[PDB]
Amino acid sequence: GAMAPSYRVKRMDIAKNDEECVVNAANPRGLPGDGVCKAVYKKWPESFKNSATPVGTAKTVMCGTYPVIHAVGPNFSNYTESEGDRELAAAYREVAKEVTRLGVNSVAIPLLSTGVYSGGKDRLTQSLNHLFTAMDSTDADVVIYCRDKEWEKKISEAIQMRT
Ligand SMILES: [Cl-]
Ligand SMILES: [Cl-]
Ligand SMILES: [Cl-]
Known part of the structure; x- marks a missing residue:
């Protein structure tokens, strides 16, 4: 770790x-x-x-x-909000199991279901909170990757707020 x-x-x-x-x-x-x-x-x-x-x-x-x-996060164009939310949380729990099994000390991760699977909605907070729920109990260094300047500032603010 x-x-x-x-x-x-x-x-x-x-x-x-x-x-x-x-x-x-x-x-x-x-x-x-x-x-x-x-x-x-x-x-x-x-x-x-x-x-x-x-x-x-x-x-x-x-x-x-x-x-x-x-x-594999859900495509929100196909799922309801309730079912898509459940599958998005589940994909991140499986990533935490794999990171733990691999024994790695760091992992690069994107925000799942925030691009073409977002169903046209802003899902930064939704996806990032499910990422934290799954990864908080792991001891790997997590580096989140994004492409938008406003998203970088919002993700950075969310990380710093909890420290
Ligand atoms: Cl996506
Ligand atoms: Cl982005
Ligand atoms: Cl680049």
């Missing part, structure tokens, strides 16, 4: 992370996809061998010895 487990946020492409493993914002079919998923496919294509997994779950595939944890 990290000596003083922390949360940090960086505004940049998660394919350039400086952590021991990465979480992909995956689709259930293991396809290259869009956004974070397409960047992950270009950087670690070998990790898409048998990466298909259901909504609300995470499946890890190694690229060399580097773990890629494919986490």
Whole structure:
């Protein structure tokens, strides 16, 4: 574990992370996809061998010895708010189990279901709070990756408020 487990946020492409493993914002079919998923496919294509997994779950595939944890958040265009909320919380609980099993000291993570699976809604607080609920009991350093300048400021404020 990290000596003083922390949360940090960086505004940049998660394919350039400086952590021991990465979480992909995956689709259930293991396809290259869009956004974070397409960047992950270009950087670690070998990790898409048998990466298909259901909504609300995470499946890890190694690229060399580097773990890629494919986490499938719900597409809010298809789920109701209540069911989508439950599956989004579940995907993050599975990421915490995988990070613990892998024994890593750090993990790079995006906010699940905040891009094309958001159903056109701002889900920063919803997704980040489910991330904290799952990851708080782990001892890995967590680095959250985002692309928007206003989202970086809001995620940073949420992290600092709890310290
Ligand atoms: Cl970048
Ligand atoms: Cl998304
Ligand atoms: Cl973003």
